[PDB]
Amino acid sequence: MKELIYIEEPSILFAHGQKCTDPRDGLALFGPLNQIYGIKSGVVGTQKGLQIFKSYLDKIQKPIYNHNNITRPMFPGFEAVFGCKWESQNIVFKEITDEEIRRYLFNASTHKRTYDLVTLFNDKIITANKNDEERVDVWFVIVPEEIYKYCRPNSVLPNELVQTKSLISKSKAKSFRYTPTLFEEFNKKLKEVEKEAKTYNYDAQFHDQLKARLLEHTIPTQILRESTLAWRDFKNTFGAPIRDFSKIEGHLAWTISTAAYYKAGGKPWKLGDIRPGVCYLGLVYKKIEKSKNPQNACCAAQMFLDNGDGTVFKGEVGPWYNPEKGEYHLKPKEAKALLTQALESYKEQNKSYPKEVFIHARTRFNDEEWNAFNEVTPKNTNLVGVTITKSKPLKLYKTEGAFPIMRGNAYIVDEKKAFLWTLGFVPKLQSTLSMEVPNPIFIEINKGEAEIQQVLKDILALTKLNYNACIYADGEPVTLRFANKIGEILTASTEIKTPPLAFKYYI
């Protein structure tokens, strides 16, 4: 009968060198690892939205309580937690008139509807940021619910509200050349159609298409729905709130503030212990379903050092898909560039190449892409390749009572493959992390040679390092948690000329 080892719960650093398991406690006791002396908030939104922000912002200054503060740390309140003050009266407002939204929103197809609205926000944001003498740390996008409702793919605006009539079918628009007739007058209607067709190239989610559009100017932003900020107000006919945060209200405040904080530019925390020179490399693909070539897909790499701030590298769009196998793999030529892109960032970052590199994905690497790596890997560098999957085939049940096994147990199949319980029960929290019985993950070293048990520890640690969400741990290592989301942002915009950019530019 094979048996399970237990991996000691990892430890993240906080200011004052206190080391703690739980960021939420860790922040309150000791605060953020590095510190900044303000959050000059930029705000884009409607009149009513702006207040909701203010009303919320004020509230957070006070401490806030969840229902079970044992299973969820209570929120002392911004000033107390971060020291730095987030001031609702130190704001920059680029207003969006309701009469402007009224205009672009009531259009027949979402793509036109969504692109036009996204266009609107950026235009202020860029315009303000470029034009204004005064710097702002973070622009706060206050999303009316109507926009959220109807600016998502598959949103269907009722015909009886359509106020502008679409000029072309979704099918035909991607194949469109505006080319000039001899007669201009005709062209004026033709340019019109060219402008509409172009919107079908951009993705139809407001959140992704905006973040993506913004990458060029490197302006961080946080996107909060009006409903989220003042959830109590938006209610069903019954008068119940549509979304109820009453139980978790402090926890929400934990999330926003933290995420606000990092985007501000100070990383709250870092892993407590790491071997030096270790470089973690998140692989990301999104099949581009658009092109007449069925293998097209996008190529993304998300590097993580100890901090978990992250860095993102724009790989090249090509035939990385094999629909038969169903996985994604890389032609050698591309593989060479990414690492080159990646290590040359590391060297610039540290002035020396990392001793160790780990690459993460969910599909066993092919052999040919993999040796395209050795050909840019410097001789002194170990280069391991790790397949991580949320295999659904294995589950561990407890003989008595209703609580699962505690996170951190591990089944080591053999010296290259093992099972890790990122999910499960936490005693520190005296409750669990999923409602169903937890599902371990499967770690294999597909390519290269490295210790199994160290990498299980290596990976459990990457669970701790999610800034965007403030929580005890995430089930995936941070490398892949956001893999799709990043995928969706790259595919969202037309041209990936983007240089590698910091991770806070994607969330």
Partner: protein
Amino acid sequence: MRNKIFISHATPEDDDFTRWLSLKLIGLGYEVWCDILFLDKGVDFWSTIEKEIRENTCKFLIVSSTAGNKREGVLKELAVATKVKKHLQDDMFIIPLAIDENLSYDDINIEIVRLNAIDFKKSWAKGLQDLLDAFEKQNVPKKPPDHSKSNLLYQQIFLHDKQAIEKEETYDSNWFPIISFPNELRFHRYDWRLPKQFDVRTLAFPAIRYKEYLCTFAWEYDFIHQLPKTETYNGQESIRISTSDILSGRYDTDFIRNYECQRLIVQLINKAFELRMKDKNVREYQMSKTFAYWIEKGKLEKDKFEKIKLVGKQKNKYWHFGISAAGKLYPSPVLMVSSHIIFTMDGINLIKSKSIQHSSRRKQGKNWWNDKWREKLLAFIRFLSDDQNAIYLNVGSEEKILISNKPLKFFGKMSYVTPSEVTLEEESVLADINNFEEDTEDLDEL
């Protein structure tokens, strides 16, 4: 000397702030005393505390709350200081702390009311900031800041009460080992006998096409009524392999290798399962990757089995507990059972819309807990058990594969201690998790 700082904590109501405050002071370098920093088994309380304030404390702090006034224990605690006050003769020694807008002046005790307070309702950080200036004002005897003291109290005061124990235990799993295998594994040079087109998935005995041969547990004779022109086959043309020498990995060939054989058995096991399944009288549901098989309504006494419910009532729907399977060879031969929740409007009928099944499963799922799942998986296997010990999977007309209903238990080095009933609140907080599941909302839930 006396440098110590006392605090009165109403309990348990104001334990949160009360907890927060002390540690911040402590890291900096201010010695502090409060009961919440010690669990007690000293038979006395009054005489370990009242004694404490007088001897060493450099200042005294109360907590103005609804249950700050109304709780007796502090009042006695303040009175000593108040009486405590006369001997020093200094008021600055005693400071109150108000944290509730709701607690009312009338409610505030008279000893309090005169007293000059620090205000926390507006913000803790501000209130606290006021205080260490007053501390600065009195020049209270306080060492330079050491927070590394503070978590060691935190890891020990709080972490200890709830933390991982060293107790070991054993864990049922979804892994059922394979009781037995047919002794030999057969390949047939049927060749001309089998047409190239033919579909070996269609076989009606588990068989897998192979590069020059067809592979099965089954005796060459077994495949007649669907594939004639086979009685022409001389059984000595059949390459046979020992079952256990594949499992041992001892087997390899110029033409074949052990991994490959292992790979092959697995597929067979899967097919062998689907086959055995139609026999069993449970209706079936096809996952896109594979099938899953579940029980229809009314086929059980009160729709239970061995007292365990397997189809019940959700809203306007009936739900059913069904399972998938696949086997593995590396690092044991076992049958892996995935669990599934499949619904029916009639209670005998599928629901067409993908998203209504999926949506339905999750909503039902939250209500369910590991004991329940274990109890349900583990009853759905004693049902298909031809014998309680195992279920017969036919792979040859006389060749069988056997699999045990007792799943393989895992040893556990480190455990925890069981809290109770907390989840249901969490579990009903999981119905309110059908909300901020937004992709445009830049948030992720627990």
